[PDB]
Short mmCIF file of N, CA, C and O in Angstrom, two decimals:
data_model
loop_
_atom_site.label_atom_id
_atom_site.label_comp_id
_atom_site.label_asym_id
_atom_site.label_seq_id
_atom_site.Cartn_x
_atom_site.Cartn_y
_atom_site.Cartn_z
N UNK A 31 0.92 -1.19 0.00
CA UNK A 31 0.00 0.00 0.00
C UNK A 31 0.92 1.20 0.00
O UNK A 31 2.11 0.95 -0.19
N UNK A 32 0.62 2.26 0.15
CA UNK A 32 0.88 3.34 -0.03
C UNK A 32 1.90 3.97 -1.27
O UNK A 32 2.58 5.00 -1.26
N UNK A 33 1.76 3.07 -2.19
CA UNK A 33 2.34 3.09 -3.44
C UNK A 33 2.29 4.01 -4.05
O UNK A 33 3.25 4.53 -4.62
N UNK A 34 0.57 4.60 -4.08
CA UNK A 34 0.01 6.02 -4.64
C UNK A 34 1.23 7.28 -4.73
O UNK A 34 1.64 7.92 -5.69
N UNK A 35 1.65 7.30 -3.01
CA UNK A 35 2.30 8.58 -2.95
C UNK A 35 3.73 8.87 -3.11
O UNK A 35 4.43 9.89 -3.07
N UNK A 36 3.98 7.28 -3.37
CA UNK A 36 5.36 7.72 -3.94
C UNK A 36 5.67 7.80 -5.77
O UNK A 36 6.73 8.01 -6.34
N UNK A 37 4.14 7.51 -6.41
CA UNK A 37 3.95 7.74 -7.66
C UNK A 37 3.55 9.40 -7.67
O UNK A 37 4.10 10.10 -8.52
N UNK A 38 2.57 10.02 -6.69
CA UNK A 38 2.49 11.33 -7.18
C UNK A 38 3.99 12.14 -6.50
O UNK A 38 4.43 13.25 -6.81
N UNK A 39 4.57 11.14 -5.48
CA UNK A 39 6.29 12.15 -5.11
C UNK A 39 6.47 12.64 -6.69
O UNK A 39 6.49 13.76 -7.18
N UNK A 40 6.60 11.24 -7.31
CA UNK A 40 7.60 11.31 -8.36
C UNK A 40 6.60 12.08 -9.26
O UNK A 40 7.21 12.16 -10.33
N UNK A 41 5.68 12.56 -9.38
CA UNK A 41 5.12 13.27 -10.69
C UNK A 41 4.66 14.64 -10.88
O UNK A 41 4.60 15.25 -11.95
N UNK A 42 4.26 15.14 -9.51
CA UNK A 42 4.13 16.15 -9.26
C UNK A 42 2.46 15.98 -9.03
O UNK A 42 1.65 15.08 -9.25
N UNK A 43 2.38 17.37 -8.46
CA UNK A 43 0.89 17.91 -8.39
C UNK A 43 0.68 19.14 -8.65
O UNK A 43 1.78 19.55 -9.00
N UNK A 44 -0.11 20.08 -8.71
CA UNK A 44 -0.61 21.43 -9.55
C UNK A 44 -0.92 22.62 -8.08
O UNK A 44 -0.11 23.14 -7.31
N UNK A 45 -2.28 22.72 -8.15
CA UNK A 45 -2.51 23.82 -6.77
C UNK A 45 -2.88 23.27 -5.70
O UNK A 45 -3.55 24.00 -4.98
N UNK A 46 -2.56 21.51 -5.06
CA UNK A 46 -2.90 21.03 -4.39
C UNK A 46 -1.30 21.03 -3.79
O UNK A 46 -1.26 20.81 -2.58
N UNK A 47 -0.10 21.23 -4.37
CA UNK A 47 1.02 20.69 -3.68
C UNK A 47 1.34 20.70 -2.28
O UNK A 47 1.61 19.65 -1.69
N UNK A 48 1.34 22.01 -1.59
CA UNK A 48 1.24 22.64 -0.04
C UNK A 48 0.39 21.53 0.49
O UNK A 48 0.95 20.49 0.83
N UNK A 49 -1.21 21.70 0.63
CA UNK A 49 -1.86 20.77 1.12
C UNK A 49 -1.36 18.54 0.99
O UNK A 49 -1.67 17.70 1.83
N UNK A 50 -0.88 18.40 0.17
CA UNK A 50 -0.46 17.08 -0.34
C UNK A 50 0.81 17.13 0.43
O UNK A 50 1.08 16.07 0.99
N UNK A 51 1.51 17.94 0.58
CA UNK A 51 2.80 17.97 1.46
C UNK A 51 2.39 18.02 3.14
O UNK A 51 3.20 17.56 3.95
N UNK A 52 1.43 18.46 3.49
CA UNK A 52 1.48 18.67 4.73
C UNK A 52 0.83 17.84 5.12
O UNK A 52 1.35 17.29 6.09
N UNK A 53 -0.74 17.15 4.65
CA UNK A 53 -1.56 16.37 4.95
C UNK A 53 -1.02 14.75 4.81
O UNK A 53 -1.48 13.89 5.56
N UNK A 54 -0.11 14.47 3.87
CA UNK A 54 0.06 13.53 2.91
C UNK A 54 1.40 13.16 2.85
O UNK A 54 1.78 12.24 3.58
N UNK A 55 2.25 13.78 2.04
CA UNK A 55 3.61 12.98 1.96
C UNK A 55 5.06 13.13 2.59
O UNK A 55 6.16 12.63 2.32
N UNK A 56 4.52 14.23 3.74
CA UNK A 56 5.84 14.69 4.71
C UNK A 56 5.22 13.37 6.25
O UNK A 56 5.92 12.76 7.06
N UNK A 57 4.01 13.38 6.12
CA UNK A 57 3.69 12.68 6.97
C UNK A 57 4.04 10.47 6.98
O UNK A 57 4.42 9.69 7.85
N UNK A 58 3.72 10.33 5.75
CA UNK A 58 4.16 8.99 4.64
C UNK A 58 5.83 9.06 5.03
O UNK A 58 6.13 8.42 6.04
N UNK A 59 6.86 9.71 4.38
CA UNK A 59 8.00 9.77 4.71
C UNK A 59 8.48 9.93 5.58
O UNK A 59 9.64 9.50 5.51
N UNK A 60 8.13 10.54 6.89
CA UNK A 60 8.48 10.65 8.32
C UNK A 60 8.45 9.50 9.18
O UNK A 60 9.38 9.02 9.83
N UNK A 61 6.53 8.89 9.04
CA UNK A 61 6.14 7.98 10.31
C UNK A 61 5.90 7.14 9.37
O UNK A 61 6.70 6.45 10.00
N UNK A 62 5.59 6.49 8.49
CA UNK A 62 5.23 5.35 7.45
C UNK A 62 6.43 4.64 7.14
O UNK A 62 6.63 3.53 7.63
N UNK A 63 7.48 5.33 6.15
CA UNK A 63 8.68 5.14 5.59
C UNK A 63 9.83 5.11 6.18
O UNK A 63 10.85 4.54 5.78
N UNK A 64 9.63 6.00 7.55
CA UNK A 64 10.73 6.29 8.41
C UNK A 64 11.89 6.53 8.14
O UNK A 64 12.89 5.93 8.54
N UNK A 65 11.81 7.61 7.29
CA UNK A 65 13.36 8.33 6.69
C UNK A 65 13.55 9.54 7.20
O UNK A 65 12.58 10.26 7.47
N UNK A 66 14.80 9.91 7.40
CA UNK A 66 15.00 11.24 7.73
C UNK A 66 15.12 12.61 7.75
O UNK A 66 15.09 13.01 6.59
N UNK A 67 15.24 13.52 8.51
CA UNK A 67 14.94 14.84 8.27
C UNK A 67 15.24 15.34 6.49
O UNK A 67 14.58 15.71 5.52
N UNK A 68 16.62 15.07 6.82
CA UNK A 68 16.95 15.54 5.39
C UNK A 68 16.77 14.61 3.92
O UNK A 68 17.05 15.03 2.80
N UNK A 69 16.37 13.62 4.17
CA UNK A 69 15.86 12.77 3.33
C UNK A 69 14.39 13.65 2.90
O UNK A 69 14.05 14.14 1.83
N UNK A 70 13.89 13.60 3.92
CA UNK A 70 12.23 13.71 3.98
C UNK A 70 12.57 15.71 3.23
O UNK A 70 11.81 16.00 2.30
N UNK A 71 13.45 16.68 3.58
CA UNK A 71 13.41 17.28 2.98
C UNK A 71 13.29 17.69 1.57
O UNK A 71 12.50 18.40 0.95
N UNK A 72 14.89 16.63 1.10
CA UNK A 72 15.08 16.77 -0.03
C UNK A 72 13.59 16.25 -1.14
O UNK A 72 13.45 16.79 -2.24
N UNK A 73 12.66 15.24 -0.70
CA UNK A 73 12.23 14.67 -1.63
C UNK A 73 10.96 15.66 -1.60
O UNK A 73 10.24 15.88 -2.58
N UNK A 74 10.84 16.05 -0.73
CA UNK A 74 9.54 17.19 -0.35
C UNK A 74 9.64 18.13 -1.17
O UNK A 74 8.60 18.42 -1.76
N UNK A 75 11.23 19.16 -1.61
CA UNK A 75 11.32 20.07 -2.41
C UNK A 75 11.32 19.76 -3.77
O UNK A 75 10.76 20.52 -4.56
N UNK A 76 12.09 18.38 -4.30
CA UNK A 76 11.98 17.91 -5.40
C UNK A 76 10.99 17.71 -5.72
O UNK A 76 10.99 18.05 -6.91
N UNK A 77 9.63 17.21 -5.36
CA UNK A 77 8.49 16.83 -5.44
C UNK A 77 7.80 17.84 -5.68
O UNK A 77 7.12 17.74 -6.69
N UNK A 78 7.71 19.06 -4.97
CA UNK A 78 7.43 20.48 -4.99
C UNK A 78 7.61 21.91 -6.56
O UNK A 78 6.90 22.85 -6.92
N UNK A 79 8.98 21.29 -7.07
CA UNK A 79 9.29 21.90 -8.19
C UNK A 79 9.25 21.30 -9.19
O UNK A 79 9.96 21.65 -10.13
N UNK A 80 8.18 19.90 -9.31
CA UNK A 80 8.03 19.65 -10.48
C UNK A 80 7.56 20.35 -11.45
O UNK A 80 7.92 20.29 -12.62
N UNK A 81 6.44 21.26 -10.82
CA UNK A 81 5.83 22.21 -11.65
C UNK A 81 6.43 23.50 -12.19
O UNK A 81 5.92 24.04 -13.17
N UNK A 82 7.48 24.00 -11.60
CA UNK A 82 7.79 25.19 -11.88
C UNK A 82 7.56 26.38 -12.08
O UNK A 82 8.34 27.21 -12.54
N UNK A 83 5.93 26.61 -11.61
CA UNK A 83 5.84 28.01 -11.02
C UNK A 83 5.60 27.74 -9.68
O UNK A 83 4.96 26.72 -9.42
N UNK A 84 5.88 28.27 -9.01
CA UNK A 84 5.61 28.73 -7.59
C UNK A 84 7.04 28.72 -6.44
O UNK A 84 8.18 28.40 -6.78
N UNK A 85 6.66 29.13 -5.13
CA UNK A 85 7.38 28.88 -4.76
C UNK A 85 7.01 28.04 -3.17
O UNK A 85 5.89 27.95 -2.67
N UNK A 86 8.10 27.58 -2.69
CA UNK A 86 7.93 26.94 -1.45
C UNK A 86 9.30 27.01 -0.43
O UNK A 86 10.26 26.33 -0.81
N UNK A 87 9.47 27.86 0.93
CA UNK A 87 9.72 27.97 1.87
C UNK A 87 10.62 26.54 2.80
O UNK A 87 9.87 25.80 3.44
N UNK A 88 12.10 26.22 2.82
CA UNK A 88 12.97 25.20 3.79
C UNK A 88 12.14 25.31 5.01
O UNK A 88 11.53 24.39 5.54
N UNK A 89 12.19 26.81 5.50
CA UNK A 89 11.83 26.51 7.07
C UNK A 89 10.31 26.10 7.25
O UNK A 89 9.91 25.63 8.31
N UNK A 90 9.47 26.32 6.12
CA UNK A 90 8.47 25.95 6.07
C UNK A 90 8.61 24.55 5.81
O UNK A 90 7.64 23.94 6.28
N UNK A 91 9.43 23.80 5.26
CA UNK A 91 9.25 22.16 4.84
C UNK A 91 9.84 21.58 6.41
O UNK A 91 9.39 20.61 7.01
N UNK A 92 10.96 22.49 6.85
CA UNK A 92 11.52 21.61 7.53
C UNK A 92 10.82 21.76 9.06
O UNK A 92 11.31 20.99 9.89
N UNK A 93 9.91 22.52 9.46
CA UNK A 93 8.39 22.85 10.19
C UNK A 93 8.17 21.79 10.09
O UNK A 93 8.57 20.88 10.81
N UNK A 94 7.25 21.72 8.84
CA UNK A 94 5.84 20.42 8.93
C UNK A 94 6.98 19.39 9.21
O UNK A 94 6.64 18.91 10.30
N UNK A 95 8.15 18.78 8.83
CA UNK A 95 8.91 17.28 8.71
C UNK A 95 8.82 17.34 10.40
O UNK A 95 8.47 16.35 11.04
N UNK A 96 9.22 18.72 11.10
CA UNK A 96 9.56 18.05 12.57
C UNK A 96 8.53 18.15 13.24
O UNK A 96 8.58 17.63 14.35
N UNK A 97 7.24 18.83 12.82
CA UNK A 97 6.17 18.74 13.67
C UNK A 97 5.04 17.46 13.28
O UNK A 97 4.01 17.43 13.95
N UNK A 98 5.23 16.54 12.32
CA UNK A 98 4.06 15.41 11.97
C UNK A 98 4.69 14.65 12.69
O UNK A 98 4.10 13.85 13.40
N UNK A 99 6.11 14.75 12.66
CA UNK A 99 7.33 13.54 13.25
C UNK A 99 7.23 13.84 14.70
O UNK A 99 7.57 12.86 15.37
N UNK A 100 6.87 14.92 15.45
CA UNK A 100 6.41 14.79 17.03
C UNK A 100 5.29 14.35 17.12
O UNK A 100 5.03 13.84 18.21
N UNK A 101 4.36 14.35 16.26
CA UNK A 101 2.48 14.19 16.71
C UNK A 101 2.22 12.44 16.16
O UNK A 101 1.25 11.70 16.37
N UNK A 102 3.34 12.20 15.50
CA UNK A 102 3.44 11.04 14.57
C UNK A 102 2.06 10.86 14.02
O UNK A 102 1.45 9.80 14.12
N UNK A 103 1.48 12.19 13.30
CA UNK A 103 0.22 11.87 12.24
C UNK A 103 0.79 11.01 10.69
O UNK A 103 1.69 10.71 9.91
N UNK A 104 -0.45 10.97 11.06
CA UNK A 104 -0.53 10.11 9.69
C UNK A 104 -0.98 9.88 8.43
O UNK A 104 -1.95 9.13 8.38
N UNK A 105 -0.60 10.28 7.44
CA UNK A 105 -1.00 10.54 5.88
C UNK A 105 -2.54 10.38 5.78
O UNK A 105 -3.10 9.40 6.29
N UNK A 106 -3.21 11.34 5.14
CA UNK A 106 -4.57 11.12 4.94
C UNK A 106 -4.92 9.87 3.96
O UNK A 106 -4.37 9.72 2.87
N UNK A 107 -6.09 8.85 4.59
CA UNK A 107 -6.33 8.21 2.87
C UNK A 107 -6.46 9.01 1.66
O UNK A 107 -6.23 10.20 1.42
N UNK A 108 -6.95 7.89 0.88
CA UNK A 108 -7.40 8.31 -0.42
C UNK A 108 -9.01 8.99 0.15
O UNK A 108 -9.36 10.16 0.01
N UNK A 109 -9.83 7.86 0.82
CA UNK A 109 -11.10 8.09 1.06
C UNK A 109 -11.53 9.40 1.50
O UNK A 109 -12.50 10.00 1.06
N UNK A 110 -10.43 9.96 2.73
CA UNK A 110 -10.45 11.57 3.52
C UNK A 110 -10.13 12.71 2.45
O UNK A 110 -10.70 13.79 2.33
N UNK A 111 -8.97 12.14 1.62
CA UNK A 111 -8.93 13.17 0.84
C UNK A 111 -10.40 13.36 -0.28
O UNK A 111 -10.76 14.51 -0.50
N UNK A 112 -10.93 12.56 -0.73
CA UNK A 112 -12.03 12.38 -1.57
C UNK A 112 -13.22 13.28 -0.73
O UNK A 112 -14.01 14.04 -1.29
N UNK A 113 -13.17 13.03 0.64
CA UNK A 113 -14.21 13.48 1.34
C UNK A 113 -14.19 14.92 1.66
O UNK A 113 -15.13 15.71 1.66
N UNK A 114 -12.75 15.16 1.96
CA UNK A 114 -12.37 16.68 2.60
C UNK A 114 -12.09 17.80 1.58
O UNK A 114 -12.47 18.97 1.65
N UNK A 115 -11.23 17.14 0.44
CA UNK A 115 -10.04 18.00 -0.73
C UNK A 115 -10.50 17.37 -1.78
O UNK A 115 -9.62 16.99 -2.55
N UNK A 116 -11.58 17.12 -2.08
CA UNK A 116 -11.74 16.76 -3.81
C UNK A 116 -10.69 17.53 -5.00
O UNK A 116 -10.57 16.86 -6.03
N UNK A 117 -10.06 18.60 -5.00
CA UNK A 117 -9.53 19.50 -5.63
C UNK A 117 -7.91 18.44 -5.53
O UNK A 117 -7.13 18.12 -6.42
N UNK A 118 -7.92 18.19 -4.39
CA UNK A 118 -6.48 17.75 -4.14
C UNK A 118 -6.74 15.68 -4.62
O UNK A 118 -5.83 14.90 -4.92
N UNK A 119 -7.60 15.49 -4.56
CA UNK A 119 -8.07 13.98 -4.98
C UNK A 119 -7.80 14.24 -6.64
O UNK A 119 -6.85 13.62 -7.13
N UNK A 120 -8.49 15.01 -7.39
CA UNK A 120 -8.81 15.22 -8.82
C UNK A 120 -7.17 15.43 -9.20
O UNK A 120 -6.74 15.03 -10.28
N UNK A 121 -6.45 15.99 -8.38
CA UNK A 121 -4.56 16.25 -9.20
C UNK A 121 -4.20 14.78 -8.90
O UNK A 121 -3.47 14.25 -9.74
N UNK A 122 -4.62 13.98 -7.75
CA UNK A 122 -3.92 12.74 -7.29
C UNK A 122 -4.20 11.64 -7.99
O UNK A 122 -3.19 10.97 -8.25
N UNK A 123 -5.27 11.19 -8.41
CA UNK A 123 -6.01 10.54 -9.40
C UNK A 123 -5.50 10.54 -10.84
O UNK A 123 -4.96 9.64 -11.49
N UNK A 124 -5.90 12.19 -11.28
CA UNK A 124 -5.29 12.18 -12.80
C UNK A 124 -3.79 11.72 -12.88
O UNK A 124 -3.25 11.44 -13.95
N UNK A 125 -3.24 11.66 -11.79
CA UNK A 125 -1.46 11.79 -12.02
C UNK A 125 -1.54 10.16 -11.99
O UNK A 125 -0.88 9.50 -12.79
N UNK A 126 -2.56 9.43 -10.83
CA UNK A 126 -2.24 7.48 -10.76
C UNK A 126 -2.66 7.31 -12.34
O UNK A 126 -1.89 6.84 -13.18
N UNK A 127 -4.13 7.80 -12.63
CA UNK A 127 -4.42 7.55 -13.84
C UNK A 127 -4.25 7.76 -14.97
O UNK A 127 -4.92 7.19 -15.82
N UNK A 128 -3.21 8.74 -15.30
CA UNK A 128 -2.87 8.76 -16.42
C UNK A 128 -1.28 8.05 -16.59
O UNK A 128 -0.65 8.20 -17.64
N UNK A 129 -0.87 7.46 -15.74
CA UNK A 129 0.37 6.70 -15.68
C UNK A 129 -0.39 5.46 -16.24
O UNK A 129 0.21 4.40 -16.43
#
């Protein structure tokens, strides 16, 4: 399981990225995967600039990595995201499904 999110790591996402990083794959790589700070950084920013407009904030990545990693939360499903973030389901989906 959790295969999904290391297919959208690798592909990117659109105006859902922030939310997918904080809810989703800083949380997966921290307490799921159990890799480290700077692991969990690097793949967070790479993951982040697939798109190439925008921007995104270290002390802001490296925030959420040490605060999910104290609360040890845990990646939203698919189902919560469907229920809560449809916007953020519809980038996650098109990216499994069009692979």
């Amino acid at each position: 399981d959790y295969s999904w999110i290391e297919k959208v790591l690798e592909m990117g996402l659109q105006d859902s990225r922030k939310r997918f990083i904080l809810y989703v794959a800083s949380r997966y790589l921290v307490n799921v995967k159990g890799v480290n700070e700077d692991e969990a950084l690097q793949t967070l920013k790479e993951f982040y600039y697939k798109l190439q407009s925008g921007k995104v904030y270290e002390s802001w990545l490296k925030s959420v990595i040490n605060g999910v990693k104290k609360k040890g939360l845990l990646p939203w499903s698919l189902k919560r995201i469907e229920e809560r973030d449809k916007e953020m389901y519809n980038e996650i989906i098109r990216v499994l499904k069009n692979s």
